[PDB]
Design a protein around this ligand. Structure first.
Ligand SMILES: [Cl-]
Ligand SMILES: [Cl-]
Ligand SMILES: [Cl-]
Ligand SMILES: [Cl-]
Ligand SMILES: [Cl-]
Ligand SMILES: [Cl-]
Ligand SMILES: [Cl-]
Ligand SMILES: [Cl-]
Ligand SMILES: [Cl-]
Ligand SMILES: [Cl-]
Ligand SMILES: [Cl-]
Ligand SMILES: [Cl-]
Ligand SMILES: [Cl-]
Ligand SMILES: [Zn+2]
Ligand SMILES: [Zn+2]
Ligand SMILES: [Zn+2]
Ligand SMILES: [Zn+2]
Ligand SMILES: [Zn+2]
Ligand SMILES: [Zn+2]
Ligand SMILES: [Zn+2]
Ligand SMILES: [Zn+2]
Ligand SMILES: [Zn+2]
Ligand SMILES: [Zn+2]
Ligand SMILES: [Zn+2]
Ligand SMILES: [Zn+2]
Ligand SMILES: [Zn+2]
Ligand SMILES: [Zn+2]
Ligand SMILES: [Zn+2]
Ligand SMILES: [Zn+2]
Ligand SMILES: [Zn+2]
Ligand SMILES: [Zn+2]
Ligand SMILES: [Zn+2]
Ligand SMILES: [Zn+2]
Lengths: 221, 224, 220, 222, 222
């Protein structure tokens, strides 16, 4: 166990990020990030159809393309490791804009319908042995309004996002992670998670879940 | 360079803490803290006179007793190391309650008058090779002088408290200032608090260097 | 705020243009351009060494002369202003003909090695508070093959050059500018940039970066 | 003379657009377009007969209804100006799908038969003091106008150098007079290339400016 | 051409000012100064050696760090304009405490050795297209420039007629070209004499206006 620099909340142009998968990997890799998870949006059906009909970009991975999406991440795991000794973890941001809950899952293997209740989504992700994070809206909300309700539900809560800290997770002593919520280049510099863990995916998930050796770290230019 | 667990803002019953020094050291050592600074209060003359006048406790080390205070900590350095492999750094909290600024000095050697202007205090502390932290008032707390004037003091402090007890102060992070996180310990239960994790060799000069540079510094919430 | 006529991509005989600096400045001045950047080439070493070897002209400012070049441009800012109320901005075209990227920097202060990676080059230009443009090759290329990758990299992309529009910039809704890529007198008639901005260098760079009040205009 | 943002090529559900007239106006108004022309289709006889015959929608304003169509637009001129300070100009798209020329006319007052020769159409429109633009087929879609550009060099006040999200290099390379429009049918077509023109904010001044074409730029609304 | 409020003589903690660069900029920005030049000291060799030797602070930017100093100022040009619409101009105070001439240069691009003769300094600065001002010693403080005014009649673009809260009648009585600045080191020095100049809001226009000196006034900010 050394301390690893991690970012569990990162988007590409496969959903609504600015940048291609390869480039997001090169950026984080060249900046010494040890562990990154790609968490592109899957979206509730209302939101997706609202976008289709207004001719807006979907900004999401469709259920039909989700397998092809994970396949791209499976392949990038290889490049990320061989080129940077970086651990890339396939994930997803389960994004419900109708009921206003965004849930990040790390080490996902199957699509989960974002329109399902929070507990069913989470039970589904736990059946996949994914890590489950309550994401916090970025500075620029159902989970955060009902934190006591969801106390044993999530493995960790976002205490930090972009350049912002959220005192409510700390005050309640909840389990915490800190991520960039990356969409564009300059978001690479953000609060990150430092975790004391063997450098393998099961170990990393365990360490976040335990949350006894997890700190938050602000990466600056 | 392994990452070390650090708390640079800790008080004992020598100033206004609830607990005896020995007991504070034992508690931090048994909780596996790697670096602790004891930063008991020195307070401006006017505040002292006022407490003296109201017959309330001084809650501070007097100028006359400062070397005796340092002498207790130097002996505590020995025990801290022998019993826990812990680095105790003598420090102080320079407490101006008249003008409302609290400055934590880590690895202090000489008394400095808390009444002086901020930059005079800091220049004095730099001559001693002490690490100089801008302390944040705790949430159980007025408009505080350093925090109202952050841009003015940006090149004055080696670090600002981004966190204190169980609270985070987003202003530090938003501006990307150098940061530390401490307990501001007074009571048993303040041991469980935000702390600083720093990548550094386990020696006092190396630790101060790491904090000043502030590129391998994280914050860490110690829980029961 | 008035809309300004700008040309951010212009060469002189100090690199590979046909004309003297003074004459290029007058030409643009007299045709009523509000903002012009002189962007003479600096070239990667491999390409310089090749030309040296084949006895071909360098067509570039050498690293050693780069300050003397900018010096000439500082002096021309004074004259361009006094004579024509025109804003001349020192610039450069970072020309890598080994890996085929040309990068135009507006309000450049220091030489940047064109042999560096694109991202290193750009981060260096941003450190100088320069405006960074993806030059498109004239109709008579690594960046254009990799536009998605460089989306957050450039402040703007050439959507037009000489008399040619490049549909790919627009189709992608990328930030755009339009310039002459001037080398010859007749290149003064070309696609140019109309930008709504205060008439000052910082304001202009900001308005190109924002790109919300930027149009293209054909000078005939 | 400030620079006005303009769209001279917009359709409503009165021809083959998807949207109510009122909506179209509200959409352009609230996006800060200064000048809009509604240019619904009128269509050559042969095409209309063919459509009637196949039971297809006409997607055109009939000759019988043309004046009612203009009346709908005159009333919207008032609301466009009052609500948004926007100049709405009644126009039309003269649509010959038999010989393949689409001609956009801005500030139209009378119906003109799309089956007439290009040149006779343009003369009829110039007798009405209408601005006359050669419309370029949108990318999604051999066109007569565009195949015979030299023939029509002095025929049109302007050619479409841009349409929806596409640029057509042929107009610029020839250094012809140009405008850029949305060719709007669907809600999302409001984000398109548009024309930026330096002009007094009135319909005669505007038509004059496009015609001169020396203070005309194109502008991508995103 | 409206009248711009200007301060061409301001120091930061990078030389001997009390305040961070960012603060200085924020202070002038929020007080509505239109144009500021940061003019930290560069100092003659002999003075620097003397200071090193006495263990005093250098209170200067070294030749080695000059380009980094300018880089700090270029980045602040951007933030000054974006946050305040203020023009920040990189400058310098050429400080010869051996022969006693202080020369302020506005829009500087290269380091110039303060140990050079007055005239050689000014030529080097005019080769950079910098504006060149004779700085007047502040009152709190026999100076070469001021003792030899006739000698330097056509040497400087302007002389300091005012500094902090003091006016120097010698410049006006001679009817020389003038500017008025704060010579800022401490927070309270923002309230000082300043220059009001009728100019287009750009650095070349501004330098030209001061140089002509026919639309330049002095203004006490309180
Ligand atoms: Cl989020
Ligand atoms: Cl999001
Ligand atoms: Cl405190
Ligand atoms: Cl306290
Ligand atoms: Cl030690
Ligand atoms: Cl090119
Ligand atoms: Cl070229
Ligand atoms: Cl069409
Ligand atoms: Cl159509
Ligand atoms: Cl009218
Ligand atoms: Cl002075
Ligand atoms: Cl001084
Ligand atoms: Cl400027
Ligand atoms: Zn997103
Ligand atoms: Zn989200
Ligand atoms: Zn977000
Ligand atoms: Zn997100
Ligand atoms: Zn206390
Ligand atoms: Zn305190
Ligand atoms: Zn406290
Ligand atoms: Zn305290
Ligand atoms: Zn060339
Ligand atoms: Zn080129
Ligand atoms: Zn070229
Ligand atoms: Zn070129
Ligand atoms: Zn249609
Ligand atoms: Zn058509
Ligand atoms: Zn069409
Ligand atoms: Zn149409
Ligand atoms: Zn000074
Ligand atoms: Zn001086
Ligand atoms: Zn002075
Ligand atoms: Zn001075």
């Amino acid at each position: 166990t050394e301390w690893l620099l991690c970012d569990f909340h990162v988007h590409t142009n496969m959903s609504d990020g600015h940048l291609p998968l390869g480039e997001v990997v090169d950026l984080f890799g060249k900046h010494g990030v040890d562990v990154v998870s790609i968490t592109d949006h899957i979206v509730d059906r209302r939101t997706l159809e609202q976008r289709k009909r207004n001719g807006e970009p979907l900004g999401a991975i469709t259920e039909d393309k989700f397998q092809d999406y994970l396949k791209r991440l499976w392949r990038e795991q290889k490049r990320a490791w061989e080129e940077y000794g970086m651990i890339l973890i396939p994930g997803v941001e389960i994004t419900n804009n109708t009921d206003l809950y965004h849930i990040v899952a790390v080490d996902v293997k199957e699509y989960v319908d974002p329109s399902l209740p929070v507990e069913e989504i989470v039970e589904k992700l736990k059946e996949q042995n994914a890590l489950v994070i309550a994401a916090h809206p970025d500075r620029k909300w159902y989970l955060w309004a009902n934190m006591e309700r969801f106390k044993d539900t999530f493995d960790a809560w976002e205490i930090a996002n972009r350049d912002d800290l959220f005192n409510s997770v700390g005050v309640k002593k909840y389990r915490y992670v800190a991520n960039s919520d990356f969409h564009e280049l300059w978001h690479v510099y953000s609060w990150k998670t430092l975790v004391k863990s063997e450098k393998n995916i099961e170990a990393i998930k365990e360490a976040i879940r335990k949350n006894t050796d997890v700190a938050i770290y602000l990466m600056r230019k």
